[PDB]
Amino acid sequence: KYVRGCYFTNWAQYRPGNGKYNPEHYQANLCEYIFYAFAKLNDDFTVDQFEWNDIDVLYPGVMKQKSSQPDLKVLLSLGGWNAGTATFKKMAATYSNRAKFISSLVSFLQQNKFDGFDLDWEYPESSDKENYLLLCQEILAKFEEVAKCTSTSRLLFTAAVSANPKTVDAGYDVPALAKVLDFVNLMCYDFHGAWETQTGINSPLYSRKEDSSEFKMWNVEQSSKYWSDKGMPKKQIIIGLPTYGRGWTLSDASKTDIGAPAQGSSTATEYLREAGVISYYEVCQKLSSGAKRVWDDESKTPYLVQGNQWFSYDDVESMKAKINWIKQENYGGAFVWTLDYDDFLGSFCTEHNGKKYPLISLMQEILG
Amino acid sequence: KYVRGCYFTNWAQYRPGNGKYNPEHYQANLCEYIFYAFAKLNDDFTVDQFEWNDIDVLYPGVMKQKSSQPDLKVLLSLGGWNAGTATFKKMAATYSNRAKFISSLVSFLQQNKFDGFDLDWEYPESSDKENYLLLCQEILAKFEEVAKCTSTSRLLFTAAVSANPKTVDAGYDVPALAKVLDFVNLMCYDFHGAWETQTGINSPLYSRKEDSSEFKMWNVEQSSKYWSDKGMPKKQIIIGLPTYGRGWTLSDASKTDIGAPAQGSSTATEYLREAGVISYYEVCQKLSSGAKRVWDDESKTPYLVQGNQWFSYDDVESMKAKINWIKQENYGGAFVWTLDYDDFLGSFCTEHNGKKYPLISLMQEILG
């Protein structure tokens, strides 16, 4: 039995044309859990919607999906990269601060009919290690208290967690968190990207011989193993699968290997409009335009070259390898970041004969 | 500004052919409140599903309708005519018994995602008047405590109540109940039926000059006015609207007036299969077969004659008069018993050009 999770994002509504992603684009039985990114943590530690139409439109639209998938669970995620850590740090620092946050959170979850809560603090530091654990222990205790009122099933509680072993060491009490979190969404991606001066793999399954020694742990296999070594049971370790890629502008268009020199991020793409990233469906458009694809069998990922633009990304072949490896190694399951980067219409790519969600469907197909 | 309620019944799934009623037959915005008839009160005072597929199929099927109507509220009803009063009487007799029931009910409501509770004890007698009020005060108190315990909006709490002024006098502390019930569903129907040896009107809007004095209050106008006179604010009095009729077999096929002698109940009909009752859509079937309709302008209701079969029923004209009257007198709103007696497929009646719910649609159309 495997967890299959999927992140919905409340800013994908702003993509133009056929990139615009609405709750109704979800397909029944793709995911057992949808994680809603993101709510907002106010300065006064209360919780509220982040986008103007979360409560009135998008939350109900996502909850609607339970009509064709009765087992679907929808959790609210809080935090993320852009939110930073300053407010989390102060909120977790005292019992009174944490109690105020937990009270606001529980009311927000109940009023909006969520099934659980996904804590995406990116990331707790050494100074936060104790406070982060207390926060998690007190969230679970509250959720249990709420369930005891009526003998109902309790809200779920998960967390998205760093794949960097040094970060894991500093911020997480792993054996203690295993008793309190239902599972952890391992963020084993963004290992390399436009912040570096040479091309590299966003989410390699295995290390490559040409990896420098400092990066030998910076892959799916070793990052997940580290969490297991630190005391997290494998069934609680959920492997993260990106449906986006990261891109560079090459210094030299004749040097296109992994590790080739770069002069900066890739040019912002048509739908994501953000330098240095690309969606899978945008990759399909570039392939139709004649972009060159290379399969890197060592890491089990492809990369794309179009002129001086170079992207590391994930596709059906890399997802197949990774999801089969999840079964083989008996980790807890998979989750995808995000629903809205796949070919969710089936019309952006030609090679899948119009199949919707050619990437994300693989979870149900292989693990289901 | 006006309550619009509708009763769903969990035995309408057993009617044949186009009489079979499924939750997906509900039409968005017909009702603001759906009342689910009925749960089961066990001998030990605990609450449970009545039909084998309530929890597994029908409850979530009704809840699904919130997807196309986000403001829909679904309440669970307990009691009804066939349940009788024996268990209610024992359950309400002591604080201990009521607390066991209330704890069981609150758990059942929250486990099954109900928005509220509708108490249909038919009917508290003089020996129950104090216990009935205590039961209602304690239900509301628990609902308020549960709301704080689980950080949710409190469950709604209604009751379906007698329209017989003698029964109201004996069983209901009307000013005290107004303080704890959100509103009352006035059962201003079944005033006359096959238990009587002569024909009469199921739910007359007004009294008729030929009514004997014993029945001067047995109509919508006076029974609702009585609840008002007894201390229930008009905005808490919800006027009941039947979508069924009641029938007799005439003693003399040449004597077809209101008050004509009868020798027994009407023959059981094709879909309801219960002697003495008929659905509106079954009346439509008989109108197509040449039955005679008579409009009684005094009561603002029609009756149907077909051979020696005689039915008092309600139709678009009687519903129009009653619902427009509700607005004129500023009562609290209307409710229909039941969704499954209307022409809910639009397949039985011809005078409405295939309109679904020709009767029940009038609530939305007139009360807004």
Residue numbers in the entry:
A (entry chain B), B (entry chain A): 32 to 399
What does the study report here?
Here, we focus on the identification and characterization of proteins selectively secreted by the first larval stages of T. suis. We screened a set of n = 6 recombinant larval proteins for immunomodulatory properties and identified an enzymatically active T. suis chitinase that interfered with recruitment of immune cells and inflammatory reactions in a murine model of allergic airway disease. While our in vitro data suggest no direct immunomodulatory effects on, e.g., DC function or T cell activation, we observed disease amelioration to be associated with suppression of eosinophil recruitment into the lung and increased numbers of alternatively activated RELMα+ lung macrophages. Since mammalian host chitinases, both true chitinases with enzymatic activity (AMCase and chitotriosidase) and chitinase-like protein (CLP) molecules which can bind to chitin but lack enzymatic activity, are implicated as either mediators or biomarkers involved in airway inflammation and fibrosis, disease amelioration by treating with a worm chitinase was rather surprising.
The three-dimensional structure of the T. suis chitinase as determined by high-resolution X-ray crystallography revealed high similarities to mouse acidic mammalian chitinase (AMCase) but a unique ability of T. suis chitinase to form dimers. Our data indicate that the structural similarities between the parasite and host chitinase contribute to the disease-ameliorating effect of the helminth-derived chitinase on allergic lung inflammation. Our findings further reveal that T. suis chitinase treatment of allergic mice not only inhibited host AMCase expression on mRNA level but also interfered with host chitinase activity in the BAL fluid, suggesting an alternative mechanism that might involve the high degree of structural similarity between host and nematode chitinases.
